[PDB]
Amino acid sequence: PLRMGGNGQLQYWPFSSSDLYNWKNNNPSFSEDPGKLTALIESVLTTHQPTWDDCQQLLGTLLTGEEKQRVLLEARKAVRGNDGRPTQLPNEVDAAFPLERPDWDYTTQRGRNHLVLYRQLLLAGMQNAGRSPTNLAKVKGITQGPNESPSAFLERLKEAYRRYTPYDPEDPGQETNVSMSFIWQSAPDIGRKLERLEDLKSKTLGDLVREAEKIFNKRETPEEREERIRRETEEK
Amino acid sequence: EAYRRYTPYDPEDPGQETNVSMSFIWQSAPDIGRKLERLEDLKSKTLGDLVREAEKIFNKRETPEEREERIRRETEEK
Amino acid sequence: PLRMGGNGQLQYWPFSSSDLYNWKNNNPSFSEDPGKLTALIESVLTTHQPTWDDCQQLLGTLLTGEEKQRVLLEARKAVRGNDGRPTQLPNEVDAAFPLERPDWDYTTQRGRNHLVLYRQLLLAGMQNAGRSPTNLAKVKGITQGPNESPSAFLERLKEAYRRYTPYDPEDPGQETNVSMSFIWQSAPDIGRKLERLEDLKSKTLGDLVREAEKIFNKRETPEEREERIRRETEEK
Amino acid sequence: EAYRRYTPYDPEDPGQETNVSMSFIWQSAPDIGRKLERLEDLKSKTLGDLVREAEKIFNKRETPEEREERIRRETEEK
Amino acid sequence: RGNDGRPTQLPNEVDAAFPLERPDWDYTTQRGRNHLVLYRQLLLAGMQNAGRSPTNLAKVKGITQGPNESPSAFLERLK
């Protein structure tokens, strides 16, 4: 880690192994749920200002050999030339994201800039490495749970679009597509009512969530239902 | 036809293409849908592309006669 | 450990025993899997900038008596004379990798250079000691498991090359060699398809892994298979 | 050779190519013939093309040893 | 190749270098000899390029030393 010392100069100290192992032990593996470790590492990359060696310890400790490899190749694939476009030119790729220890000196603006870029690319690598290619079945498999709010369900549905399709669920051109999955895969009472909405074509995704909440928010409390039953007085 | 009759969305609109495409993939016959889902650069496939890819699988129907012949020539007993 | 202080001067502090014991407890023994501790120590040698005494604590804590001995003799065998060749001259060996506390002063360029070299040789020692006499049968014995991903299998295969051969599986000159083992020892369905690839000679190790993943990723779910069987409707 | 010996047609004549091609497809081994028949743009295939396509199938012979190994690893009992 | 060292599909050039019908090349003349040299060179090139034998790694893995087979004989079959 690096921090600005009291004398206006960067100061280095190695990661405590307790931090590294705590981060590992309090999160799922990268493969299980890439978002967890990616968010943790994104944070640490900022607060701990790791050097290249520090990043090797992070990756080496939190990822398996196969995960780290995926991340490193993904990071190198994220390198851009001075024209802002991808580049596979060995010298450019190596200069941005070196696989072997670089001579970056954190006391120099040159060293610092490389470190900044390295960390940015590392993050990109992790973000991209966490992609279950395309698998539409995963999107169709997101079904609202019986206690799950419509907004929570929609967020899980969008997460599946992100992970398992090439479509961005936040794109304006995807709205009807996400809307149809939302209606079809909502809890059955909700989906049947959303399907019956007047001027359904006119409903935004936000509108549909609000309409589903009205039904959900009409959950008819268990206690209430039980009370009704008791006061049923209809015998057989 | 179902989009036309039972939704306000025109399935021929350019803005509906991904929507119709997703229904097409999801509701195709299971062998076809599983293969369309696995297409490389799926995001880049038009509705016309998806139909052509599905036809390749369908057109690989593996004739009933052919299948039966294979079974006969199976020679694997139990 | 040493770090550059806020005053531009190296600053020393002893290892926290919690770090040493955490490193030990979160890894296999050196004998079980030398790569684990070797990678951890390689990292620490950089981030913690250990002195000679610090290195003795590292080794003393993470390795058994027999492992440490192997490593130390391997490190001394890695010493090079000024002509870049191996040397068994006692004075040269002792000067580079002393078995007893040296008078190295980290506040001097002389002391620092010796420390750098010492750490480099220590790493070399570990890398070579983790070199279980050459045993090609161990490499041929790495076979992809029925649930094992191609990338996970390749990492195990590379680990066997490292431990049981003198060949570095990451060398460009070893690529076809590792590729052939990868094809031959992949799961049978995968190996048969990789063998049939068009322009096979042109496939990199990375290409082969991606092609194997396409087959693996076509795993044909157990549920799916069962469903197919049920819908079989072919009786006897 | 059979065309030469037992017909008046020269199998190397450009005007005989489709004729020889059809015999080649029809009289190839059954697995090969069925696949050649299914080739896309079959009309466009020369005799040389057809031979190369048949070689791809033949060259996919699925070694006896390989087949046996598969069977052994079958683990499906009856 | 044409005189500019590049490929050519010009019938007259192709025919002149590698004729499909008997040419009038006279081996007692430097002209005839040079054409013969070129013809042979092109014939070799043709064979080299027509080659391109389909790959099949299973065939290489299938070469196993026989119980009576000497190591050098086995190595030659493997090669």
Residue numbers in the entry:
A (entry chain D), C (entry chain B): 1 to 236
B (entry chain C), D (entry chain A): 159 to 236
E (entry chain A): 80 to 158
How does the study describe this entry?
Immature retroviruses are built by the Gag polyprotein; Gag is then cut into domains, and the resulting CA capsid proteins form the mature capsid, which can mediate infection of a new cell. Murine leukemia virus (MLV), the prototypic member of the γ-retroviruses, is commonly used in comparative studies and as a basis for retroviral vector design. The CA domain and immediate downstream residues mediate protein interactions in the immature shell, and, following proteolytic cleavage, CA forms the mature viral capsid.
We identified 1,299 pentamerically coordinated positions from the 134 virions in our dataset, extracted subtomograms at these positions, and iteratively aligned and averaged them to generate a structure of the mature MLV CA pentamer at a resolution of 8.6 Å. The CA-CTD layer displays high curvature at the pentamer positions, and the CA-NTD pentamer protrudes further outward from the CA-CTD layer than in the hexamer. Comparison of the interfaces between neighboring CA molecules in the pentamer and hexamer revealed subtle differences in these interactions but no dramatic opening of the interdomain cleft as we previously observed in the HIV-1 pentamer. The mature MLV cores consisted of flat areas of lattice joined at seams with locally higher curvature, and with pentamers positioned at the highly curved vertices. Within spiral or nested cores, more than 12 pentamers are required to accommodate the increased total curvature, and we observed as many as 24 pentamers within a single virus particle. As the total curvature of a multilayered structure is greater than that in a sphere, more than 12 pentamers are present in MLV particles. The presence of pentamers, rather than gaps as in the immature lattice, suggests that having a CA lattice without holes may be important during early stages of the MLV lifecycle.
